[PDB]
Design a protein around this ligand. Structure first.
Ligand code: A1AN1
Ligand code: PR8
Lengths: 1036, 554
């Protein structure tokens, strides 16, 4: 029975005892945070004197008699009992046979790994002796970590063997006085806490984007299966890393940590990467701390940050300085440091541990120092761990590595490749200390040749015939067929060819030729196609101009291109205010020109098409397509796609962006029937699908925004065209709304997603959806014939599959450059470092190879949103918004506030009423709080750039978070929050950690609730439903 | 230094470490540094790894290798010495004849003392401790202390033979009464010495001005004089223990500490004290504003040796108290019965030296270090004595630095720095408990003169203040043990109280002290109190709730 006399002392917990108390209270339903040694001893061992020496050892150390009391107290306490014998069991297995002995042993050892400790009621150490044979023993010795750092076992076992020798040889204990752990508790209370929290808030000052490693799936359930992978570097690589360290004036630990940092940077596409470091938080100021038994090991955030031009040497010195600066403050609890970060709970998500001196080998050699009757013959260690990955590094003669990972979250191939990447970085650094960080490759030859073969697997032979030669050679195949149709008039291929010959004869008489760009300002009436083909047949490049564009742009294009001639309709001539000849395409002299074929008086490689893109310059830049770029497209589109000869296709787009003419050429060069969209039907969608039905139209070209929105409008839903068979789209990250998903099934319409910047060619990847399944955010697909896609880093280094990097395009669909402003071309086009001689072009877009070999889009590199520390697919938010039957049309944008802080706002068009909290709840039903927009705006229609892409300029500025009203039904329920958090009178809706709570204060909250309300609310419930609303299930 | 050139090699395992090879380049490490520091600690040198790692070259880290122990000046210090709080209190009290406020004792030796031998001792013993040479400049409308470089006028010495008068005690009394008057505080020997020859042997007089001496300092001085005299009688060269931080350096670091953030942290405690004490007032038999020491009379109460040995050896265990906690609880009960006030404030003389300045060592310093702090006693809930004793223990444990702070705030902190503290509370009653008399009988080579007269160290000294001095405390209560009996002396101002009322208060004290001794011996359980458990801010309700929760969990 208890009596007060049995308590020796009480203390508050140290920071890391508080951390492992948190663990033990969290994981209770399957808890185990339990070191297990197995030590095998051969020789003669008196199990009596080993029992007695264990009991003396437990008397000697107060931490072996500590029990932790948290139930109803204001504060967790250590309680040190005066006497507390531990369970010691002796099993004489020596009568059993080997196959029985080793089974009974392993069954015990496995069950002992399962047998949890009660931090209060049960002694926190266990020993078992097994006598396997007349001179063979195994010790299983398991203890909660909260007691001590596992490495302390070297001291504890030296003490144990000293006690055993003193007993068996009847001699007094020479053991030096135990360094009391209350010295550390007192020193922790004497220290200036706030100066340390200020250091840690400075250390994390600019930390923007959370680090990651490629997780297999969202953690839908806490399934865990501890799995390992291990590998080691060669002798020479290890010694050369050691030389690098000895010469950059750092420890090899700093080299290992910098190499890990560089790996994390390459995997994260970021220059600032933070990971957890496990540090021996033993301050050198404490007397005798080097032999003090207790829990000191602390997890601290370790941060490696690269400048854009920094060398690895210069990052080594930076990391050295940072680690030296951190050492004064590494006793701070990580649960406090987390509050000094915008990431809060998610700051650290994996650990790198360097084991300069393990417990094994050390314990496996010290025992040779004594004349006792036994020798340590084998040794083992087990330790559960919470993190999904831990990296252990052991700088032996070969630098050995081990990954302890949850196989529920990381694939074996992911860890295998990560190990190969670590080897490659290590070798690169070892050979040349001074390599640029962006110039270290991750990839071995097996990765490299595969990624380059992903180019050549697109290889093809094509005749490279001129685009108007390919037309001519097709038009003779069906001269009687109607090629182009307008409101009522039409042209056959014969009529097109004749009229184009006439115009080409006129132009050539007018001096048009290989050097010559011909303007067209034609009203998308029939003559526009004749204009194109006649200008090309005249051997010159057509420059399409929009009647609706500003006169400022119509002037800028004409004055910047140095176009000698423009062709227009009569009524549009007045737009051409420049001093340049302006020919009516109806001119009778051209009607009188000779209709027979003109000659292909041009080379296979000349320019033929200039269009001007928007961008970051206020000046649009004229981009130009060589004949080879489009010729490469047309043959691939025939060979491997589902355009067909007999199909009927609208030229819908606004006659000035790369896709629009690519519909024309694909339609013409396959004998189909083009219909010229009346520019009023470009807006009245009510008429578009009607015209599609009436003309049985079958191929459509539609911007991505059109698919995000127009098929979602409930009024339009029933007017969807039944004759359609293919819809082709390009422009933006595609969102296939659930309505559009359904309006694909009903008619099995093939939707095609095409990636393409203008400078490469109208498309360079395709994905085609038949309607087996359609994800909401489809990929951009596979590289077209004679193209490579290279996901590079900034040093043009290939980067591993599945990882975000710059999307470079190569092959015949690469243009000559920028027409004028030519100096920008050298910034955007270059030679392919991996296929020298082929041109290369950079899109400012990040992409990722999927495991199936599809290409996956990650938006522009200029606009990485990363709000509240977390990257946020605006496509996911736009998906959840657009799926709501209340929402017609959602655009989600990162804004900058009037302080320069980025924040999310959703611009939303509402079919039927709802209000800010209603959609905020709708998002919270499916989307994390970091990716719910802080403001919402209602508009009549999202503005669209004439090409259909949404206009980030044309949206109104926000005006005027977690805040919610006061609502308390029972302040008796809230006053615990009031007293623990201290912030204010509280609202019922408010969120514990958002209000500045943290793990340990949750323990205080539970112990208060389970005193003042006498309910044992699990520590998990405060995380599932971290608000005062959650109580209802416990009181109704 | 070559010591560290070695200690690296015998840790890192790399030979021929140079004067500026690099700890890391040699292969140092985050841990191996701890080993190097521990190995250097065997040479009594301290080095933070925070410097070994940060200045990773021997030539550069030599700038931070320090001795583990200082060796404070064994020579001479001189010049201005800032007034300590007790000294500023003294000059603020403005006594009539401040030159008559002293401490003294009279030694004896069975075969006497050779005058030249004891004078030769007093030469060196007054050289060694510097504060005893100080003088107090009665100028510039204020006082400033000065300490004197060696010369003449260290101490004043007188010699007498009393054998001509059979009443030797009266002759030595009347002659020693002179010297107490003769402290030329402006410039003169603040140590007075006399020798009185007699048929029974030689009587040796020492007297010192209180501004430069203390009880603990009188122990120090007697053990120093005992070794000095043993050395002189043995004929060896006289030399003395190594000097600790000499009093000038103490005053200096004290004024440096007197403004630090540590002491200022106490301010809300001493505010809670003064704000709660405001209305205390011990009632008076006669209303008078001041009295003179000649009006003071003293009376004594005694405990028998059995009760004394119970009080010392056993009562402490019932509550893990110390002796002061029981004596003060008995005093509380006595005032609860006698004064019938709800509260009283009792002043206590702590010895100071309270490890305040972390670098300081004053274990051998001679000076007036006494720190005076008030304590408020609750007198209401006296009925459950089992809990009045605990309330008194924990009140004594709530004093933040054993009271050294309050005098510094009162006299030496910068006056804008010290907050709302009024310092208006005045010592109507003061309580002290001395240890054994063995602070005087600390060596056998000489003994206290049987003719001690009024010339004792403590409150039973009679000559050591001028009869014309003010009464600074109305009730002065001091404990001592002699011959195994506790004695409490009540000294009081006649013309503020009459004899019967102090007889009453002293009998109420003896009654309740006996009651507490008994209660603490009859109780067989150790009922520990929240201060025993090394948890900051623990309270009775929480401690007993924790203990209830242990019973519900074991
Ligand atoms: P709430 O919102 O409040 O949030 C707070 C949280 C985060 C929830 C908090 O409660 C929390 O969960 N705590 C932090 C995260 N939890 C953990 O699980 C932390 C943790 C992980 C792993 C372990 C154990 C390890 C790792 C230690 C291994 O390394 C090692 O050798 N021991 C410590 C390091 N020092 C040494 O002993 C020797 C190695 N070298 C060193 O000296 C240092 O490592 C340097 C200085 C960093 C390198 O030296 P130099 O080259 O610079 C060994 C054992 C392996 C596991 C085991 C078995 N047990 N524990 C503990 C906690
Ligand atoms: N399907 C797509 N998915 C993702 N990004 C796309 C897609 N199509 C183009 N991009 C984007 O096109 C950008 C470059 O082409 P640019 O915007 O100058 O031209 C145009 O966009 C013209 C205008 C009419 C249609 N093409 C890329 O960075 C990529 O984000």
């Amino acid at each position: 029975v208890f009596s007060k006399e049995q308590v020796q002392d009480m203390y508050a917990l140290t920071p890391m005892q508080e951390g492992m108390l948190f663990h033990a209270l969290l994981d209770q339903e399957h808890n185990s945070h339990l070191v297990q040694m197995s030590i095998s001893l051969q020789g003669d061992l008196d199990v009596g004197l080993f029992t007695d020496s264990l009991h003396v050892l437990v008397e000697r150390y107060d931490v072996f008699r500590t029990l932790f009391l948290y139930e109803k107290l204001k504060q967790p306490l250590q309680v040190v009992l005066k006497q507390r014998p531990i369970p010691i069991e002796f099993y004489d297995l020596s009568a059993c046979d080997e196959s029985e002995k080793q089974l009974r042993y392993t069954q015990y050892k496995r069950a002992d790994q399962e047998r949890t400790f009660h931090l209060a009621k049960d002694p926190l150490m266990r020993v078992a002796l097994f006598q396997m044979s007349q001179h063979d023993y195994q010790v299983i010795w398991s203890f909660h970590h909260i007691l001590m750092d596992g490495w302390c076992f070297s001291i504890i076992f030296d003490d144990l063997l000293a006690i055993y020798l003193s007993l068996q040889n009847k001699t007094a204990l020479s053991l030096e006085p135990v360094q009391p752990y209350s010295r550390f508790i007192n020193w922790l209370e004497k220290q200036n806490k706030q100066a340390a929290l200020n250091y840690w808030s400075d250390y994390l000052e600019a930390y923007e984007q959370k680090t990651t490693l490629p997780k297999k799936e969202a953690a839908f359930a806490k399934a865990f299966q501890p799995t390992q992978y291990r590998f080691s570097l060669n002798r020479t690589l290890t010694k050369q890393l050691g030389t690098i360290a000895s010469q950059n004036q750092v420890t090899l630990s700093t080299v290992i940590q910098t190499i890990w940092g560089v790996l994390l940077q390459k995997y994260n596409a970021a220059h600032d990467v933070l990971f957890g470091s496990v540090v021996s938080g033993r301050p050198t100021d404490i007397v005798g701390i080097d032999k003090m038994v207790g829990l000191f090991i602390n997890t601290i955030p370790f941060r490696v940050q690269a400048k854009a031009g920094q060398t690895f040497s210069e990052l080594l010195q930076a990391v050295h300085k940072r680690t030296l600066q951190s050492q004064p403050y590494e006793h701070v609890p990580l649960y406090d440091i987390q509050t000094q970060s915008v990431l809060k709970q998610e700051l650290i998500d994996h650990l790198l541990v360097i084991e300069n001196y393990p417990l094994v080998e050390a314990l496996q050699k010290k025992a040779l120092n004594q004349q006792i009757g036994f020798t340590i013959t084998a040794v083992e260690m087990f330790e559960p761990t919470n993190y999904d990955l831990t990296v252990m590094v052991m700088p032996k003669e070969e630098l050995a590595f081990r990954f302890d990972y949850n196989a529920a979250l990381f694939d074996e191939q992911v860890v295998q490749k990560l190990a190969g990447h670590l080897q490659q970085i290590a070798d690169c650094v070892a050979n040349n200390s001074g390599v640029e960080l962006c110039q270290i490759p991750l990839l071995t030859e097996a990765e490299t040749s595969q990624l380059l073969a992903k180019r050549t697997e697109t290889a093809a032979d094509y005749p490279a015939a001129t685009m108007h030669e390919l037309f001519s050679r097709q038009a003779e195949k069906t001269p009687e067929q109607v090629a182009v149709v307008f409101a009522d008039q039409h042209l056959t291929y014969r009529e097109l060819d004749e009229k184009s010959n006439q115009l080409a004869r006129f132009l050539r008489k007018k001096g048009i030729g290989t050097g010559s760009l011909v303007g067209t300002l034609l009203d998308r009436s029939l003559d526009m196609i004749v204009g194109i083909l006649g200008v090309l047949k005249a051997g010159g490049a057509f420059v399409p101009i929009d009647p609706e564009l500003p006169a400022e742009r119509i002037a800028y294009m004409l004055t910047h291109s140095r176009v000698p001639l423009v062709v227009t309709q009569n009524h549009l001539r007045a737009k051409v205010t420049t001093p340049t000849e302006t020919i009516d395409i109806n001119t009778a002299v051209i009607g009188e020109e000779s209709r027979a074929p003109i000659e292909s008086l041009n080379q296979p490689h000349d320019l033929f098409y200039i269009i001007y893109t928007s961008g970051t310059t206020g000046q649009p830049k004229g981009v130009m397509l060589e004949h080879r770029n489009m010729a490469n497209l047309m043959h691939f589109t025939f060979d491997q796609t589902n355009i067909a000869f007999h199909e009927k296709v609208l030229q819908y787009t606004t006659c000035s962006f790369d896709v629009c003419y690519q519909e024309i050429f694909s339609t013409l060069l396959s004998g189909g029937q083009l219909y010229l969209i009346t520019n009023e039907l470009r807006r009245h969608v009510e008429k578009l699908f009607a015209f599609i039905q009436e003309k049985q139209i079958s191929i459509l070209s539609l911007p991505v925004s059109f698919l995000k929105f127009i098929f979602n409008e409930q009024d339009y839903a029933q007017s969807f065209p039944r004759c359609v068979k293919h819809i082709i789209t390009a422009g933006e990250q595609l969102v296939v709304t659930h309505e559009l998903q359904k309006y694909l099934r009903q008619h099995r319409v093939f939707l095609h997603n095409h990636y393409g910047p203008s400078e490469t060619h109208v498309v360079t990847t395709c994905t085609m959806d038949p309607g087996q399944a359609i994800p909401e955010l489809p990929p951009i697909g596979k590289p077209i014939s004679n193209t490579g896609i290279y996901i590079l880093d900034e040093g043009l280094q290939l980067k591993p599959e599945g990882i975000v990097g710059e999307l470079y395009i190569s092959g015949a669909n690469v243009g000559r450059g920028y027409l004028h402003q030519p100096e920008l071309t050298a910034e955007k086009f270059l030679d392919n470092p991996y296929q020298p001689g082929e041109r290369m072009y950079r899109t400012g877009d990040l992409a990722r190879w999927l495991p199936d070999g599809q290409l996956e889009f990650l938006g522009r590199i200029d606009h990485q949103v990363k709000i509240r520390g977390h990257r946020i697919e605006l496509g996911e938010i736009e998906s959840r918004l657009l799926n709501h039957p209340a929402i017609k049309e959602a655009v989600v944008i990162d804004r900058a506030d009037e302080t320069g802080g980025k924040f999310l706002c959703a611009y939303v068009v509402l079919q039927k009423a709802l209000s800010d909290e209603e959609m905020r709840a709708y998002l919270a039903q499916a989307l994390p709080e970091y990716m719910i927009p802080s403001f919402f705006v209602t508009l009549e229609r999202i503005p669209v750039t004439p090409n259909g892409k949404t206009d980030r300029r044309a949206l109104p500025k926000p005006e005027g978070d977690y805040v919610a009203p006061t609502t308390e039904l029972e302040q008796k329920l809230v006053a615990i929050w009031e007293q623990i958090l201290g912030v204010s009178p509280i609202g019922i809706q408010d969120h514990f950690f958002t209000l500045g709570g943290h793990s340990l204060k949750a323990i205080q909250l539970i112990s208060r609730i389970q005193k003042e309300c006498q309910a044992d609310v699990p520590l998990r419930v405060l995380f599932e439903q971290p608000t005062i609303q959650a109580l209802a299930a416990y009181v109704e | 230094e070559s010591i560290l050139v070695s200690i690296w090699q015998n840790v890192l395992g790399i030979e021929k470490i140079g004067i500026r090879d690099n700890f890391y380049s040699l292969g140092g490490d985050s841990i191996q540094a701890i080993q190097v520091v521990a190995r250097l600690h065997s040479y009594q040198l301290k080095l933070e790894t925070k410097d070994l790692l940060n200045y990773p070259t021997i030539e550069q880290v030599a700038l931070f290798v320090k001795s583990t122990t200082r060796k404070s000046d064994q020579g001479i210090i001189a010049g201005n010495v800032p007034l300590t709080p007790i000294q500023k209190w003294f000059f603020g009290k403005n006594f009539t004849n401040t030159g008559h406020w002293n401490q003294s004792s009279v030694l004896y030796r069975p075969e006497g003392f050779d005058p030249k031998v004891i004078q030769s001792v007093m030469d060196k013993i007054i050289e060694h401790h510097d504060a005893l040479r100080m003088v107090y400049q009665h100028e510039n409308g204020n006082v400033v202390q000065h300490n004197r470089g060696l010369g003449g006028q260290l101490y004043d010495f007188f010699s007498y033979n009393l054998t001509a008068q059979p009443d030797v005690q009266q002759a030595i009394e009347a002659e020693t009464q002179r010297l107490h008057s003769s402290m030329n505080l402006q410039e003169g020997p603040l140590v007075k010495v006399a020798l009185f020859q007699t048929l029974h042997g030689d009587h040796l007089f020492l007297a010192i001005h209180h501004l430069v001496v203390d009880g603990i300092s009188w122990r120090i001085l007697f053990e120093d004089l005992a070794t000095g005299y043993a050395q002189a009688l043995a004929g060896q060269a006289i030399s003395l223990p190594e000097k600790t931080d000499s009093f000038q350096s103490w005053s200096q670091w004290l004024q440096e500490y007197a403004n630090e953030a540590d002491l200022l942290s106490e301010i809300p405690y001493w505010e809670s004290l003064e704000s709660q004490a405001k209305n205390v007032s011990l009632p008076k038999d006669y209303e008078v504003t001041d009295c003179k020491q000649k009006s003071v009379r003293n009376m004594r109460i005694r405990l028998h040796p059995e009760e004394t040995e119970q009080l010392l050896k056993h009562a402490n265990q019932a509550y893990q108290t110390e002796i002061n906690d029981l004596l003060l609880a008995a005093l509380g009960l006595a005032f609860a019965e006698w004064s019938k006030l709800a509260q009283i404030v009792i002043h206590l003389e702590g010895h100071g030296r309270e490890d305040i300045i972390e670098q300081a060592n004053v274990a051998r310093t001679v000076g007036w270090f006494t720190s005076q702090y008030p304590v408020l006693l609750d007198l209401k809930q006296t009925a459950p004595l089992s809990d009045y004793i605990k309330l008194t223990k924990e009140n004594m444990r709530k004093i933040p630095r054993k009271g050294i702070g309050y005098d510094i705030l009162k006299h030496v902190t910068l006056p804008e720095n010290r907050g709302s503290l009024s310092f208006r509370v005045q010592p109507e009653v003061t309580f002290n408990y001395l240890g054994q008399f063995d602070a005087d009988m600390r060596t056998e080579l000489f003994t206290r003169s049987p003719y001690s007269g009024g010339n004792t160290l403590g409150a039973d000294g009679k000559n050591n203040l001028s009869p014309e001095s003010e009464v600074y405390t109305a009730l002065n209560i001091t404990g001592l043990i002699e011959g195994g009996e506790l004695v409490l002396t009540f000294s009081y101002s006649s013309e503020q109280y009459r004899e019967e009322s102090i007889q009453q208060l002293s009998q109420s004290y003896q009654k309740h002290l006996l009651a507490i001794i008994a209660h603490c011996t009859e109780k067989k359980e150790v009922e520990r109190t929240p201060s025993d458990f090394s948890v900051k801010g623990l309270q009775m309700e929480e401690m007993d709730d924790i203990f209830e929760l242990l019973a519900n969990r074991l």
